[PDB]
Every structure is written in structure tokens, then in C-alpha cells.
Write a protein that binds this ligand. Structure first.
Ligand code: IPD
Ligand code: CA
Ligand code: CA
Ligand code: CA
Ligand code: CA
Lengths: 258, 254
């Protein structure tokens, strides 16, 4: 509770500093990451921090309390739109998720969740997810994946059965879209642990389901591909449109994560 | 100003009604409600005027080009990111445009020659960009289509990133406001783009179909909108080389 409370005020303080550096006027990702790393260590010197801008690569992430932070998820959105970016924080203890935070800084909306205690949009509880079929589902997927040698071709059937397709440019906020019901599913061939660590606690708290594109479970020990959705639509995307291309997807997987 | 004022009031009042129908309940009839309300109210007050919408010589007289709800799939699935869109034309000429992001509470609007607004605030004129530093609006569905896919692949690969929001009217506005540097699709009806185009043109934006032909309200078309620079660039470096292929499609589609 002290940890949750401490973490909730940290991510809020980090948002204030982000707006300071904007109203005034990459260094900004560095600034915010250093703030969060330094603030965590000051109170908890034996916690570890897995960060994108260069904290904790080659730490056994299953040992102790681990903070997995993306200080600005959606930097292109940050640069080009001045909005639609998130601070993402996931706290794991002894390799087991405890809490997840995804803060839409410019909307001023904090999405949060404690394992077993449901998920929230600020003060509002989020509803459990209902199953959907692919043919009545909006899916999160970027156009860039569809132009890729053999992965493109595998994703085109999914795009075409899907009711429609969207792309927001923040993996953390797109996972939270699935958690809030704004998207039925979201998928990508490459994410790092800092991109999903926070969003996954929230997703799991509304009965969503996550795996990589081969159905294998996700963890913070490394990068991976991503399939997230409601359970029913996860079964359908994995079972129908991915498992038939297992061998191609395996070879792809071993090429990306080598 | 009289007509402009009428239109501004009417679209704001339509959005209010949309919400009353959400607070008490769904898309099919809400859509019908909003069409009836807008068409009926225009035709009572200006019965000489034409109203073009989903359910005529557009060079003659005053023409209202109306999408009561653009982004119906977002309406159903997200309960947000959908817009009411109204283009007004007088004697074949743009007069006014309105795109009302109902749930976000933001009316984008403009009278031709007079600037574009977000509520009461003026919008900034657009600056040029290069595709390779540009975020583009293109739906993944267009990447999967037989000859479209290969024409669009190269543009997606060179752009900094791509995005898809699911509302043509709001994606054109996103271009008008600096959020996307360009937006493109192979088909769109007059009511999807009429409002947005007026707004776009007032920030020094730039629209054509995918063959570079100018956009009119006389029928459906494909769409390329952007700041002037990256419009020139997308059309001449990436679309020009497939003119004949794009024409076959245009003729095959329209
Ligand atoms: O650089 P960054 O904005 O923190 O992170 C990126 C965002 O999540 C983006 O939407 C996704 O497409 C990329 O795969 C990520 O790398
Ligand atoms: Ca980042
Ligand atoms: Ca990221
Ligand atoms: Ca419509
Ligand atoms: Ca429409």
C-alpha cells in the first residue's frame, strides 16, 4: 500500500515535470527516466529499475522488487502531436506482477491496477471484458507490419476478417484500449518489457489475455511479439490465423530475438 | 454570417441531442434521429436549399453536404471519436465547414476566406514537411488490397509512422490541426470530406484525389490531403509512377 501509494505519486510527479519541460520551450525521456530512477532509489535503495533509456539491462528481473519503466511511450506522438503519449510503470515482486500504471499525461488520465484488486481509469472501475468474434472486432495494428516480407501476409487475413483496424502509436495506451474495451484486440511483432509491463496488469485485471504471437506467455525477462484481446477473440486470432503459420512465425521469431 | 450562424447553432444542438440519446439507452436510430433533425431543420428554414447526405446538381444554389455521424464504428465500439460533418456550398463554391467531435466537445469550423477555428481559437497555418519526418493517416485495410497494397506499401515504408483513427472527417481535421502531416484513402463520399476540406484549405492545406485531380462534391473519390510540400512529394514521387494503375482502379471503382 505504501509502495502503491509511493508509486502513484511518483508517476504523477513525473508527469508534472514533463509538462514543465514542454510549456517551457530525447533529453526529455532521459530527464524523466533519471527523475524516476533517482526518486525510486532514494526511498528503496535495494529495488531495481528496468528502463528503456538505459537502466537495468542484464538484471535478473525475477529477483526482488523490479520497476519496469518507459518514461515516454509514444515519443513520435510526443514530438508530432504533443499528446497521446504515456508514462508506463510496472512493479513486479519476486518475478510476479504487483501493480501497473499507464498515465496519459496530456489527457490527465491515470490507468492503474493492483493484482487481484481490479483496474481503474482514475477513480472509475473498469468492467470485465466480454468475448467478441473477429468479424465484429476493431483491432489495433499498425500499417507498417503489413508491408513486411511474410509477417505482412499472415496479418492481412486478420485485418480482412476484422471489422476494422486502428493504430494510435502507443503500445502502452493500445494495451489499455483493449483493457477499457476501446479495441477488442491489439498486436505487434516487437515490444520491449517496458512497453507492456504496466499495461498487462491492468489488462489481466479485466480478464483480458496476453501472449506472444505463438501463444507463449509474456514476461519481463525479454522483448517479445504481442497478441492481446478478450479471451474469445484471442483464441480465434491465435487458433485460426496464427497457428496455421506456426513454422513461418517460429523462424521469424528466432530471427528477431537472436 | 446569417447562414454560418444558423449552421454553427444547428450542429452544436445536434451533438447535444446525440448525447441525450446515449445517456438514455442504438447507433441505427441515433443516426436516424440526427439526420432527421438536421435535414428537417435546414429544409424548414431554407426550403430552396439542397441537402446531400447518405440516405442533384451541386453547382446550383446552396448545397449542404451532411454526415450526421461519421465514425459509426467508433460510435458503437468506443462511444467516442465520431463526428457530425457539414459542408455548405453556394453556386458550386465552398462556403463553410464544420466537424463536431461530439464527445470531445470540440467544434472545428471555418468560413472560406476567414480562417479556421477550434471553438473560438484560430488555427495555425500549416508548414511543409518531408514524408520521411511525417506521420500519415492510412488504414491497414488499404494495405491488403491487390494493387492498392503495393502502391501504398512504398509510402508507408518511407513515412516516419502511420496512424488510423477511423473517421475521415476527424482525420482530415487532424491534418488541419498539425496532428497528422497527411491522410489518404481510396474511397470517400462527399459528406465525409466536405466539412474538413474547408477547414483544411483555411490553414493552407492542400487536397486532391489520388490522381492529383481537384476534389468536388459531385461524387465519391479517393483522397490525398496534407501540407503543401508533402502533398507534392507523395503525389509526384510515390503516386505519379502508378498513374495508369491508379486510373484503372478509379475507373473500376467509380
Ligand atoms: O519509442 P517509444 O515511443 O517509447 O515506443 C514505441 C511505441 O510503443 C510505438 O507505438 C510502438 O509501435 C513501438 O513498437 C515502440 O517502440
Ligand atoms: Ca520511450
Ligand atoms: Ca516505448
Ligand atoms: Ca455516416
Ligand atoms: Ca462517413
Amino acid at each position: 500500500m505504501a509502495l502503491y501509494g509511493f508509486a502513484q505519486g511518483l508517476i504523477q510527479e513525473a508527469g508534472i515535470r514533463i509538462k514543465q519541460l514542454m510549456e517551457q520551450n530525447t533529453n526529455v525521456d532521459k530527464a524523466t527516466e533519471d527523475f524516476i530512477f533517482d526518486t525510486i532509489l532514494e526511498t528503496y535503495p535495494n529495488h531495481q529499475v528496468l528502463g528503456e533509456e538505459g537502466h537495468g539491462h542484464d538484471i535478473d528481473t525475477s529477483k526482488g522488487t523490479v520497476w519496469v519503466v518507459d518514461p515516454i511511450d509514444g515519443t513520435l506522438n510526443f514530438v508530432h502531436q504533443q499528446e497521446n503519449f504515456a508514462i508506463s510503470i510496472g512493479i513486479y515482486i519476486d518475478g510476479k506482477p504487483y501493480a501497473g500504471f499507464v498515465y496519459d499525461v496530456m489527457a490527465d488520465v491515470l490507468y492503474h491496477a493492483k493484482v487481484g484488486e481490479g483496474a481503474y481509469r482514475g477513480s472509475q472501475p473498469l468492467k470485465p471484458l466480454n468475448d467478441s468474434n473477429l468479424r465484429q472486432s476493431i483491432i489495433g495494428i499498425n500499417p507498417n507490419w503489413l508491408t513486411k516480407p511474410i509477417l505482412g501476409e499472415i496479418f492481412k487475413e486478420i485485418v480482412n476478417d476484422s471489422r476494422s483496424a486502428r493504430a494510435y502509436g502507443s503500445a502502452a495506451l493500445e494495451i489499455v484500449s483493449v483493457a477499457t474495451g476501446n479495441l477488442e484486440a491489439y498486436m505487434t511483432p516487437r515490444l520491449q518489457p517496458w512497453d507492456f509491463a504496466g499495461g498487462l496488469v491492468i489488462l489481466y485485471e479485466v480478464n483480458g489475455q496476453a501472449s506472444n504471437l505463438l501463444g507463449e506467455p509474456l514476461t519481463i525477462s525479454g522483448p517479445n511479439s504481442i497478441l492481446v484481446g478478450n479471451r474469445g477473440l484471442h483464441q480465434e486470432i491465435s487458433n485460426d490465423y496464427l497457428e496455421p503459420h506456426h513454422d513461418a512465425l517460429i523462424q521469424l521469431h528466432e530471427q528477431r530475438f537472436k
